[PDB]
Design an enzyme around this catalytic site. Structure first.
Site, PDB file in Angstrom:
ATOM      1  N   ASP A 152       0.819  -1.207   0.000  1.00  0.00           N
ATOM      2  CA  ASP A 152       0.000   0.000   0.000  1.00  0.00           C
ATOM      3  C   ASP A 152       0.855   1.261   0.000  1.00  0.00           C
ATOM      4  O   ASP A 152       1.398   1.635   1.040  1.00  0.00           O
ATOM      5  CB  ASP A 152      -0.889   0.007   1.241  1.00  0.00           C
ATOM      6  CG  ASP A 152      -1.950   1.085   1.192  1.00  0.00           C
ATOM      7  OD1 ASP A 152      -2.174   1.646   0.101  1.00  0.00           O
ATOM      8  OD2 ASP A 152      -2.571   1.368   2.239  1.00  0.00           O
ATOM      9  N   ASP A 205      -1.138   5.464  -5.692  1.00  0.00           N
ATOM     10  CA  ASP A 205      -1.582   4.637  -4.575  1.00  0.00           C
ATOM     11  C   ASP A 205      -1.952   3.230  -4.988  1.00  0.00           C
ATOM     12  O   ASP A 205      -3.005   3.000  -5.565  1.00  0.00           O
ATOM     13  CB  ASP A 205      -2.750   5.305  -3.846  1.00  0.00           C
ATOM     14  CG  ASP A 205      -3.261   4.481  -2.698  1.00  0.00           C
ATOM     15  OD1 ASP A 205      -2.592   3.495  -2.323  1.00  0.00           O
ATOM     16  OD2 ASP A 205      -4.341   4.809  -2.171  1.00  0.00           O
TER      17      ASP A 205
HETATM   18  N1  LIG Z   1      -4.189   3.321  -0.029  1.00  0.00           N
HETATM   19  C1  LIG Z   1      -5.170   2.859   0.794  1.00  0.00           C
HETATM   20  N2  LIG Z   1      -5.019   1.941   1.717  1.00  0.00           N
HETATM   21  C2  LIG Z   1      -6.308   1.907   2.544  1.00  0.00           C
HETATM   22  C3  LIG Z   1      -6.866   0.472   2.537  1.00  0.00           C
HETATM   23  C4  LIG Z   1      -6.717  -0.411   1.454  1.00  0.00           C
HETATM   24  C5  LIG Z   1      -7.251  -1.700   1.500  1.00  0.00           C
HETATM   25  C6  LIG Z   1      -7.948  -2.141   2.620  1.00  0.00           C
HETATM   26  C7  LIG Z   1      -8.110  -1.286   3.707  1.00  0.00           C
HETATM   27  C8  LIG Z   1      -7.576   0.006   3.666  1.00  0.00           C
HETATM   28  C9  LIG Z   1      -5.981   2.430   3.952  1.00  0.00           C
HETATM   29  C10 LIG Z   1      -5.003   1.788   4.729  1.00  0.00           C
HETATM   30  C11 LIG Z   1      -4.678   2.241   6.008  1.00  0.00           C
HETATM   31  C12 LIG Z   1      -5.337   3.346   6.533  1.00  0.00           C
HETATM   32  C13 LIG Z   1      -6.304   4.001   5.778  1.00  0.00           C
HETATM   33  C14 LIG Z   1      -6.627   3.544   4.498  1.00  0.00           C
HETATM   34  C15 LIG Z   1      -7.205   2.915   1.769  1.00  0.00           C
HETATM   35  N3  LIG Z   1      -8.481   3.029   1.941  1.00  0.00           N
HETATM   36  C16 LIG Z   1      -9.180   3.872   0.946  1.00  0.00           C
HETATM   37  C17 LIG Z   1      -8.243   4.857   0.226  1.00  0.00           C
HETATM   38  C18 LIG Z   1      -7.069   4.087  -0.367  1.00  0.00           C
HETATM   39  N4  LIG Z   1      -6.445   3.355   0.718  1.00  0.00           N
END
Ligand SMILES: NC1=NC(c2ccccc2)(c2ccccc2)C2=NCCCN12
Length: 369
Positions: A35, A222
Site C-alpha cells: 500500500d 496509490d
Molecule cells: N491506499 C489505501 N489503503 C487503505 C486500505 C486499502 C485496502 C484495505 C483497507 C484500507 C488504507 C489503509 C490504512 C489506513 C487508511 C486507508 C485505503 N483506503 C481507501 C483509500 C485508499 N487506501
C-alpha cells in the site's frame, strides 16, 4: 538478486496486491497488502470473520510491547509494538519494525482477498498515531543496506474473482520488468507519494482545464487504491469525453458510475470503441513533462464483463492499480521522484499499447496545497 522478487505479489482483482511476509519468532506467515497510500505496518492480530490467519504476539519470543494504542478512523484500532519482520521473497534481511496489531476493525479487511495485514509504504508524515512511528520502509532502509527505493510492477489479470500477479522490487530497479525509457515525475512532498499532473487528454483531445484542477487538492500514486480516481470537475470532463468516443454503443449510467458491470462474450469486447487516456506528469525540468497513456483494457477491469475503474474523488487525483497496471513504477525515495516505464506485462491489443512518452513542453503553477 531481484530475480527472486519477481512475481512475489499476488491478489484478487479489485482486492489489492499482497506480498508474503513473516512476523515474529518463530516466523508467522502472513499475506500483506502493498500500500503506497498509507504509512503503517498494520496486521490482523485477533480473530476476524474475514481472517483465516492472524499475527499472534504471544507466540513470538521477539515481540516487544510499546504500550501505546492506535485508533484510526477514516476504521482499525490496535496496539503498538515492534517485532522481527521479513519478506521471504524480498531482500534477504530481517528488520525490527513497528507493528500495529489490529485488535478491532470495521470494513477494513476484505472477504476472500487472502491478505491479513497492510504494508504502508508512504512517509512518516501520515503515519498513525503521528510521525514519530517510523514506517516499515524507513526502518528497513535504516537497519539494512537496502537502497532507499522500491518499484512495483502490477500486472493484473489478462466465476471466481480473477487472480492478479505482480512484483515488488525492493531496493532497486529490475530492467527486465519494463521496456523503453523510465520517465520521472518529482515527488512534490513526502507524505503520500504526491505528484503533479499538468495535462490530460482523452483520445488525443486535451481536456483544456487549468492544471490546478488535475491536482485539487493533490494527486497521489496509490497501489492500495484500485481505480483511477479523479477530482469531480475532471471526472465529469473525463467521462463526457469517454462517453462520446464510445457513443456507438450505449451503456447504463450505472456503468459509468462504476456500480454496474457491462458484458460481451469471449473476446468480442469492442476495445477499439473506448479511447486511450493520457496523463501528463510534471517532469524533473520546469516546463518539461511526460505522458503515460492507458488503454481501456486497464480502465475496464474484469469482473466477458467489466466494471468502469474510473471513479470520482473528493480528495484529489488517485492513480491507483489500474493506472499502475500499465507500467513499471519506481518509487525513487532517495531522489524524491517517481519513474514510469511501459511494463513488460501490460495488457494491449494489436492496434494500441500503454505508453510512456516524453518530453512535452508545458510551462509549474499546477500544485494546489
Ligand atoms: N491506499 C489505501 N489503503 C487503505 C486500505 C486499502 C485496502 C484495505 C483497507 C484500507 C488504507 C489503509 C490504512 C489506513 C487508511 C486507508 C485505503 N483506503 C481507501 C483509500 C485508499 N487506501
Amino acid at each position: 538478486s531481484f530475480v527472486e522478487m519477481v512475481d512475489n505479489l499476488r491478489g484478487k482483482s479489485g482486492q489489492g496486491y499482497y506480498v508474503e511476509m513473516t512476523v515474529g519468532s518463530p516466523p508467522q506467515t502472513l499475506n500483506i497488502l502493498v500500500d503506497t497510500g498509507s504509512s503503517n505496518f498494520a496486521v490482523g492480530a485477533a480473530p476476524h470473520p474475514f481472517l483465516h490467519r492472524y499475527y499472534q504476539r504471544q507466540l513470538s519470543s521477539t515481540y516487544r510491547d510499546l504500550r501505546k494504542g492506535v485508533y484510526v478512523p477514516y476504521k482499525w484500532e490496535g496496539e503498538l509494538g515492534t517485532d522481527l519482520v521479513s519478506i521471504p521473497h524480498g531482500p534477504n534481511v530481517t528488520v525490527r519494525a513497528n507493528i500495529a496489531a489490529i485488535t478491532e476493525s470495521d470494513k477494513f479487511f476484505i472477504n476472500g482477498s487472502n491478505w491479513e495485514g497492510i504494508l504502508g509504504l508512504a512517509y512518516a508524515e501520515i503515519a498513525r498515531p503521528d510521525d514519530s512511528l517510523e514506517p516499515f520502509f524507513d526502518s528497513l532502509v535504516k537497519q539494512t543496506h537496502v537502497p532507499n527505493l522500491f518499484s512495483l510492477q502490477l500486472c493484473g489479470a489478462g466465476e471466481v474473482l480473477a487472480s492478479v500477479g505482480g512484483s515488488m522490487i525492493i531496493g532497486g530497479i529490475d530492467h527486465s520488468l519494463y521496456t523503453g525509457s523510465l520517465w520521472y515525475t518529482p515527488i512534490r512532498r513526502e507524505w503520500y507519494y504526491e505528484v503533479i499532473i499538468v495535462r490530460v487528454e482523452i483520445n488525443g483531445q486535451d481536456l483544456k482545464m487549468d492544471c490546478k484542477e488535475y491536482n485539487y487538492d493533490k494527486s497521489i500514486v496509490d497501489s492500495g487504491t484500485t481505480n483511477l480516481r479523479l477530482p469531480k470537475k475532471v471526472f465529469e470532463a473525463a467521462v463526457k469525453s469517454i462517453k462520446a468516443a464510445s457513443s456507438t454503443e450505449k451503456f447504463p449510467d450505472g456503468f459509468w458510475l462504476g456500480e454496474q458491470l457491462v458484458c460481451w462474450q469471449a473476446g468480442t469486447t469492442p476495445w477499439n470503441i473506448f479511447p486511450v487516456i493520457s496523463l501528463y506528469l510534471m517532469g524533473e525540468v520546469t516546463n518539461q513533462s511526460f505522458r503515460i497513456t492507458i488503454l481501456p483494457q486497464q480502465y475496464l477491469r474484469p469482473v466477458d464483463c467489466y466494471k468502469f475503474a474510473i471513479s470520482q474523488s473528493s480528495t484529489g487525483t488517485v492513480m491507483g492499480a489500474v493506472i499502475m497496471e500499465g507500467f513499471y513504477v519506481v518509487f525513487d525515495r532517495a531522489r524524491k521522484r517517481i519513474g514510469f516505464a511501459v511494463s513488460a506485462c501490460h495488457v494491449h491489443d494489436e492496434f494500441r499499447t500503454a505508453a510512456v512518452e516524453g518530453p512535452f513542453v508545458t510551462l509549474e503553477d499546477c500544485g494546489y496545497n
